[PDB]
Amino acid sequence: NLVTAFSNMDDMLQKAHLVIEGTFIYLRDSTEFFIRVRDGWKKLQLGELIPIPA
Amino acid sequence: NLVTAFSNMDDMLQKAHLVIEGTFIYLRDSTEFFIRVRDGWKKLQLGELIPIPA
Amino acid sequence: NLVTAFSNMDDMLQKAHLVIEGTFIYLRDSTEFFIRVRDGWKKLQLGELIPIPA
């Protein structure tokens, strides 16, 4: 539907049925993103962390 | 606005006016993602399929 | 929450507190995408512009 999150990848992996296909998944611990697709997930390619200006 | 989908890329290509710029596009057949932008689309870089745990 | 936008990267960089972590950020001028994460942003890897069919 939109975007949800999990503490980490393993939490995401065990809750495949709680996420509808085509939804974005944020991993709080690693600040990474995955997408729930048919029969699994796919990792979104993200760049290096851009620190917030002072 | 958010996220929509098409069966495949060609269906997406012929419906450019049905998707507002800045929207995410899921291709059901290839489980790929595109983003509708100014004057076209851009393919989102996704990783290999991560199979669901047994 | 979902998706928002800025004219360009610099406008985005000065408004870090206007975007909640886990939100997608579209840059109108460069038609690029970033994601607001913990302590900053991360650039989404996008492909070359796919022109709209005539």
Chain B residues with CB inside 8 Å of C25's CB? none
> A15: how many CB neighbours lie within 10 A of its CB?
13
Q: A6 near A25, Cβ under 8 Å?
A: yes
Q: In this structure, what CATH number is given to the domain that contains residue B21?
A: 3.40.1620.70
Of the candidates A25, B49, A48, the one whose C-alpha atom is nearest the C-alpha of residue C40 is A48
Structure tokens at B23: 């929207």
Q: B21 near C49, Cβ under 8 Å?
A: no
Q: How many domains does chain A have?
A: 1
**Residue A51 resides in a domain:** no
Q: State the nearest Cα–Cα gap between B42 and chain C, in angstroms.
A: 5
**Residue B13 resides in a domain:** yes
**Residue B15 resides in a domain:** yes
Q: How far apart are CA A2 and CA B50, in angstroms?
A: 20
> C4: how many CB neighbours lie within 10 A of its CB?
16
Cβ–Cβ below 8 Å for A52 and C16:
yes
Q: Give this entry's resolution in angstroms.
A: 2.0
Alpha helices in C1-54, H assignment, sequence order: 9-13
**Residue B2 resides in a domain:** yes
Cβ–Cβ below 8 Å for A46 and C39:
no
Enumerate residues 6+ apart whose C-beta is below 8 A from B39: C49, C51, C52
Reduce the DSSP state of residue A17 to 3 states and report it.
helix
**Residue C54 resides in a domain:** no
Q: What is the DSSP string of C10-47?
A: HHHHTTGGGS-TTEEEEETTTTEEEEEETTEEEEB-B-
**Residue C51 resides in a domain:** no
**Residue B54 resides in a domain:** no
Q: C12 near C25, Cβ under 8 Å?
A: yes
**Residue C49 resides in a domain:** no
Of the candidates C45, C34, C30, the one whose C-alpha atom is nearest the C-alpha of residue C12 is C34
C6-10: long-range pairs with CB below 8 Å, 24+? C9/C34
User: Domain residues for C36?
Assistant: 1-43
